[PDB]
Design a binder for this molecule. Structure first.
Ligand SMILES: [Cl-]
Length: 120
């Protein structure tokens, strides 16, 4: 009974929490992974690049997790109680913040499926 980590999804432009154009294939991919594990808690964690202010990035990271939760629930018909949203702000980069490509990779959402918590 291991937690399942889905692939990271870098779906956001600077200071934005809306799902940028061309995000549908990566979203559908996570959705399918969610549909294969009915009832697992869907932990949706948002992240930011290190540009801007730490407190501002915390709120932004959480709004990004909420945008993905909202898509999965409204477009993916996943019950609302399945989700738990989390924000890491700029604290856990996956790429350098020294380049635009690196910062774009850090603007992202990570999904973990947790079986020990009942959620749906
Ligand atoms: Cl926005």
């Amino acid at each position: 009974p291991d937690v399942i980590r889905l692939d990271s999804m870098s779906l956001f432009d600077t200071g934005k929490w809306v799902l940028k154009p061309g995000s549908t294939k990566r979203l559908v991919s996570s959705l399918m992974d969610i549909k294969a594990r009915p009832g697992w808690l869907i932990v949706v964690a948002g992240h930011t690049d290190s540009v801007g202010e730490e407190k501002a990035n915390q709120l932004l990271s959480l709004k990004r997790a909420e945008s993905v939760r909202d898509w999965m629930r409204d477009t993916g018909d996943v019950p609302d109680s399945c989700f738990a949203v989390q924000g890491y702000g700029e604290s856990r980069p996956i790429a350098t913040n020294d380049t635009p490509e690196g910062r774009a990779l850090n603007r992202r959402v990570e999904i973990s499926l947790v079986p020990q918590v009942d959620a749906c």
